[PDB]
Enzyme design. Structure first.
Site, PDB file in Angstrom:
ATOM      1  N   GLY E  67      27.722 -40.125  98.784  1.00  0.00           N
ATOM      2  CA  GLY E  67      28.764 -40.850  99.486  1.00  0.00           C
ATOM      3  C   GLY E  67      29.896 -41.215  98.543  1.00  0.00           C
ATOM      4  O   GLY E  67      30.073 -40.604  97.492  1.00  0.00           O
ATOM      5  N   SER E  96      23.950 -38.580  93.470  1.00  0.00           N
ATOM      6  CA  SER E  96      24.611 -39.325  92.401  1.00  0.00           C
ATOM      7  C   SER E  96      24.597 -40.835  92.625  1.00  0.00           C
ATOM      8  O   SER E  96      24.111 -41.596  91.781  1.00  0.00           O
ATOM      9  CB  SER E  96      26.052 -38.828  92.256  1.00  0.00           C
ATOM     10  N   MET E  97      25.126 -41.288  93.763  1.00  0.00           N
ATOM     11  CA  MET E  97      25.141 -42.721  94.030  1.00  0.00           C
ATOM     12  C   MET E  97      23.741 -43.222  94.354  1.00  0.00           C
ATOM     13  O   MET E  97      23.372 -44.336  93.969  1.00  0.00           O
ATOM     14  CB  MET E  97      26.104 -43.036  95.175  1.00  0.00           C
ATOM     15  N   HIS E 121      25.155 -36.174  89.212  1.00  0.00           N
ATOM     16  CA  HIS E 121      26.328 -35.416  88.802  1.00  0.00           C
ATOM     17  C   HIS E 121      27.443 -36.411  88.506  1.00  0.00           C
ATOM     18  O   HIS E 121      27.273 -37.624  88.651  1.00  0.00           O
ATOM     19  CB  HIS E 121      26.735 -34.401  89.874  1.00  0.00           C
ATOM     20  N   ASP E 170      25.614 -30.501  88.455  1.00  0.00           N
ATOM     21  CA  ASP E 170      24.501 -31.040  89.229  1.00  0.00           C
ATOM     22  C   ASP E 170      23.183 -30.847  88.489  1.00  0.00           C
ATOM     23  O   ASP E 170      22.861 -29.741  88.046  1.00  0.00           O
ATOM     24  CB  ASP E 170      24.439 -30.364  90.598  1.00  0.00           C
TER      25      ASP E 170
END
EC number: 3.4.21.92
Lengths: 55, 192, 56, 192, 192, 192, 192, 192, 192
Positions: E67, E96-97, E121, E170
């Site tokens: 997101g 990631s988040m 990432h 990634d």
């Protein structure tokens, strides 16, 4: 109230009639009685038969 | 909009929707295209009736135009699995899946209104991809057709060869004509 | 509620009440002392929380 | 529309949903494509059932056409993690991801309906971008494919090589054939 | 549809949603993409739990494909701000988040499932306009990456340089690999 | 979808919404793009708090990427007009309008989390039509720009000319950098 | 989502809506584009207040960018018809129709916030069809201009000639500038 | 969105929506385009009101830019059929069908506000197909146009020929102009 | 929006829906296009009313512009099946299928408003694909046309030849015309 309960009974009505009759059974057997407020003992037909309405 | 009706009981009055009210009386509605979402909703209703009263018949209305085969084959297993007899009433329209769920009802408790229409065809599909995958899907779908044709013969009483010649292409049949094949038992016209 | 109100309809007006068996020197219980309430004033007070809205 | 049903107890009448009513009986429905919102919802249902009685079995109905793989692994870890045995039932259709959750049930308590259809294949995916990024996802998904086959073979009791050869492409298996493969233990025909 | 459940208590029975029931137990669900609306909702839940019991642990189940970065930093500050320890659990997928919020939990209370997937990432973004504006946005996103990597190294324990090299593209990591990298403290396989 | 909670007190149990429950504590959430409907709704929350207690502080948590200028300025007049002090909290992102509503809070009550981003820029607009009409709108937006900067410089304490250069183009600022400009008074990292 | 609020009364406690709660305080919000559907809602609110208290004042917060003119006359005639005085508040934005409803308040009770924008222009319309139909609309819309200008001139106190020159093109006015025309009598900068 | 109100009663109080609250006072709102769905809903309101009180008047506020003719005739028949007199009020806009329902009220009970617009035109439709089918539809619509004009002349009192020439094309009329035709009987400007 | 009304009964006050409130009086509304979903809703209302009191006549309003013929025949079979007499009333519009449900009412209990309109035409349809399949569908629709006309002639009493001649093309009929054709029994103008 029904018989066997702390409340009143339906036989006291005759006691009163007898006292007025001077305990003359023959007179009391041909007397008149007045039961007032006979509309407060109506059955709550909407409620289920889950308890005896002694009143 | 779905209206709300009231039902009088000893404990008191309760308000229920029209569709839920009929579920209490062992009546399930099958409307619209057949899919996983509507099928799972209907199968759950059927199981609930079994627990409440496994000896009372269940009514299953069918006013659907057809749909997915896999979604409609689960209900069939549920009707033959549970002990109580599942009544089926043809109301207006009954396609391949609707007809398959109309003849699967309990023998002697199948009905079809005079102006009801029944349509039967063979399973439809299609796949896009490599030839090897198309072959696999062709072999599998060829079994689904034979598998469904066999079940119809068992509940109707017709021979498998006749079923293959009558279901190869779309066949429209009226209520009086359905009684001669075996899909239904009688026709409802009036109370008696 | 209503049950208690239905029992006073004759006490405020007048009737031969059935006094409890005994709450005094009187030893017996079956006596059921008779009394008339046709000349007995009966005051009744309450707060009627909410009646102000009904009036408006 | 979801109908409302009544559950009678000596506490007062309570209106429940068809799906919510069955939740009280340790029954969970798995409908539609597998995604994050439905998966996390089903996971919560499982965690809630073990709070009431972590010893009784949990019923899992699987009717899905497949979906995201990461979402499915979340449920699989949950099923094999909690103490109670999870009974899995195949109704309608079971794709690659749906079949994984079917054989993941408690040994000896995996059921399938006679007309249910199962399909298994290797996981899908794809990536668009630089070549270096494609290699990262190509190696990542490969780990998933081999990881899933190992788990599939363990529960089914089959060999890891046989699974890879059979799962190279879509493979459709009938209910009686599923018992031989090991995805299930028995078949339900009638309520005995 | 989300089903309902009944909770028996001293005062009687109270009805709650499946998510609401777990919220009472200091459990929050983070499902779907991370956006402002979802993040503000989760923040309100976290602060609410602090009032009831500021000394009890909080459980945060993370399952998201990623997101916006602004939303994640908002939640990270909340975990460090409030006194009670926050337990982060990764189920399914974690981007990631999702990963940054996963390692921001209380040291020693970070769990992970065996078949859970963790992806990390660098931040993404862009801007279309004049060169002067692009330069400003270019430096802004660059600072975010440095600010995020510095925090990532603190919880994981790895050096700042290692985070930069591993996050150039990634990076997918499994539950055991997460422990070595330091993103998690333990792996939950079975109860006890 | 929105979880519900209960507030247990001597009177009994009452179910409240997660956002509604916090409103009782004089807490307002400003999430998503600024618009007439959401801005007017926020104003209603401010007035309701004034009616209940004009002497208790109001907490405003801002998380927005910016929006309409007219809608944003409506809130500013509402916070300064009423007697209660309005506390502004920057969470995640604060654009021209979000930052304008941040420095507009009560002096000594403007907080911002360490991992937060703040952006400021001149207002945006446009108009298509006749030349004489463009001059009217072009002259109007210039007043808005200068009018808004005058308020930003007054609450911050900086100079108007300095602010004009900063807001001439997009200017990104971090939490500690924000304090230097005067937009905020303190930074909240941990309790006590 | 709109949050709920509980109101405590001697009879007990009921959960009211944020807009419904303020309705008891004789406060109405006019948000969004003006149209028939939303206009009738505000009209019903005004009539309801008149029945509750035909003497107490009514507060109307106007924040709108304009809309259909026909829908506005339904409201203007309502305000001037009822006995109680209607207080018009300029909040954020007030276009041609919004400004018309701003000066329709009771004399000496038309307030405006300092940072508020007011715009007055000429009525807009159009038609496609035969020439005879086009001119018919031109004659009707022309009456609307004079009809609206005459009413706007009466409350403001300015001459019709001056208003026609001002409404010939879009005229943007601020709170102090608006007082010169007579649209508003006082400015709301701080309570008391 | 829709505000909620309360109706203080001797026994206690119940909450009602703003539209249902006015319905209790024999007031019906007709907003937006006329269609089958709203027409049947309004007919129920008219029929329901005569049952509660077949002698009290009914107020009908109309604001609609026309609509379907068939739906309109259902309402007109209802007003002329039931025993109680129905009051018609024009608020803002009234098109061909809106105006027909305005003059269809009881004698001496047809009102309209001073700033209200009324438009009358002949019915419009179309049909694509064979020439014979087009001819059939052309004859029917002619009867509708003629029938509608006959009814308008009955309530207004004007001649049939004058109605035909006036409604041959779009005719915009104001409140005072409406009185001369016979559409309305009085105009409401201020109470008492 | 659907308004909510309250019905005062001996047992107390109950809050019903405007449409559901009329259902208690054996009244059903048939609004909008005829489809499978709305048909089951109307059918269920008939069956539910039958259990309550199958001695009182049922009122069925028709304001439909037409629709599918399969869903319509389901309703016709239901009306003639149940014991009570169903009174059909034409309100506004009645198309081919909408008119088949009007003449299918109890003899002597069919009403039509003076401004109501009725349209009758032969069934419509179509199909694309192989000529063999088209031939099968073509023979089916012919049965529907011949079957519908046969049933129409029974209630109306007109000869089958006359029905075929008038139904070949779209035929529009006014309320008085319908009485001579036999579709309706009487016309309702004013109460009593």
């Amino acid at each position: 109230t029904e018989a066997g309960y702390v409340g009143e009974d339906v036989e006291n009505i005759i006691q009163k009639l007898l006292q007025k009759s001077d305990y003359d059974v023959q007179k009391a057997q041909r007397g008149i009685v007045y039961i007032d407020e006979i509309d407060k003992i109506s059955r709550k037909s909407d409620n289920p038969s889950i308890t005896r309405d002694v009143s | 909009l779905v209206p709300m009706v009231i039902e009088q009981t000893s404990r008191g009055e309760r308000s229920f929707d029209i569709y839920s009210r009929l579920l209490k009386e062992r009546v399930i509605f099958l409307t619209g295209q057949v899919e996983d979402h509507m099928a799972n909703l209907i199968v759950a209703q059927m199981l609930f009736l079994e627990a409440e009263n496994p000896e009372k018949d269940i009514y299953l209305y069918i006013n659907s135009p057809g749909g997915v085969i896999t979604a409609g084959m689960s209900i069939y297993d549920t009707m033959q699995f549970i002990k109580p007899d599942v009544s089926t009433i043809c109301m207006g329209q009954a396609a391949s899946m609707g007809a398959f769920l109309l003849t699967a009802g309990a023998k002697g408790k199948r009905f079809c209104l005079p102006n009801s229409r029944v349509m039967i065809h063979q399973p439809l599909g299609g796949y896009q991809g490599q030839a090897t995958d198309i072959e696999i899907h062709a072999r599998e779908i060829l079994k689904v057709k034979g598998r469904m044709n066999e079940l119809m013969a068992l509940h109707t009483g017709q021979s498998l060869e006749q079923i293959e010649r009558d279901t190869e292409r779309d066949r429209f049949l009226s209520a009086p004509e359905a009684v001669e094949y075996g899909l239904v038992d009688s026709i409802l016209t009036h109370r008696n | 509620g209503e049950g208690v109100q239905q029992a006073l309809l004759k006490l405020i007006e007048g009737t031969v009440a059935a006094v409890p068996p005994q709450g005094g020197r009187k030893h017996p219980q079956q006596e059921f002392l008779q009394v008339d309430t046709s000349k007995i004033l009966f005051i009744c007070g309450g707060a009627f929380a909410g009646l102000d809205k009904v009036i408006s």
